[PDB]
Design a protein around this ligand. Structure first.
Ligand SMILES: [Zn+2]
Length: 257
């Protein structure tokens, strides 16, 4: 028990996860004017194989689209990294309002929702398990969602939610390339942070997309419609899962433009 409500939410997490009060916590607010242009940065290059898509699962606090990672069939290369990271998942972050659900913030501004595309260093570690705790183990792309116009590339994801209504339900989810969800240009901010929920490892190199993608209120309504309870129990909706921002504490956020 760790959640997003008062008794076990983000303000309490530290009682248990002392690393909550670390020096590399995420999300952070991004101050555009204090960011630092690094000419060593490369374009990120994604290469997913839609055939790696596996399942979609309800984890109570969120939902997950999991990927087969026994190969280098779906990888991320470029940006800051000199080796390649293997794709293992995507998931979203939202809030109880359609207007305030992002984790990362830009210049004090909170977006409606956030997608995270997570990878691990296959070059260096043997599994996600090993990798998960090391300084350079994970890399996540974060895409800011802005409420507006319906985003039709999210349809295959929403139809799938029907089958994963309550906690612990899984379903097959295949032939899906997540790179369909990224913005048009892939310019980014990067900083050293961590997972945005327990275990809160500071094992993540973030990549925030300069560009946002859309979603409508009703799409968003859908996420918030899943349940956190097991089937047969009283309904408890998946209202929100976003962490407030954390002091930057000496960290530098670099830009690829
Ligand atoms: Zn996330």
């Amino acid at each position: 028990d760790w959640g997003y409500d008062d008794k076990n939410g983000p303000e309490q997490w530290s009682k248990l996860y002392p690393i909550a009060n670390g020096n590399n916590q995420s999300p952070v607010d991004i101050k555009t004017s204090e960011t630092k242009h690094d000419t060593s940065l490369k374009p990120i290059s994604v290469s997913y194989n839609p055939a790696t898509a596996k399942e979609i699962i309800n984890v109570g606090h969120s939902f997950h689209v999991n990927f087969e990672d026994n190969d280098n069939r779906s990888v991320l290369k470029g940006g800051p990294f000199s080796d390649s990271y293997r794709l293992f998942q995507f998931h979203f972050h939202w809030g109880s309002t359609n207007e305030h659900g992002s984790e990362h913030t830009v210049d004090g501004v909170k977006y409606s929702a956030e997608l995270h595309v997570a990878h691990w260093n296959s070059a260096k570690y043997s599994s996600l398990a090993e990798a998960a705790s090391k300084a350079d183990g994970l890399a996540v792309i974060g895409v800011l969602m802005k409420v507006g116009e319906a985003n039709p590339k999210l349809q295959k994801v929403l139809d799938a939610l029907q089958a994963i209504k309550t906690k612990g339900k899984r379903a097959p989810f295949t032939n899906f390339d997540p790179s369909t969800l990224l913005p048009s240009s892939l310019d980014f901010w990067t900083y050293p942070g961590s997972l945005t929920h327990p275990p809160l490892y500071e094992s993540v190199t973030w990549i925030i997309c300069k560009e946002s993608i859309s979603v409508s209120s009703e799409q968003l309504a859908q996420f918030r419609s899943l349940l956190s309870n097991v089937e047969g129990d009283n309904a408890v909706p998946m209202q929100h899962n976003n962490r407030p921002t954390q002091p930057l504490k000496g960290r530098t956020v670099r830009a690829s433009f």
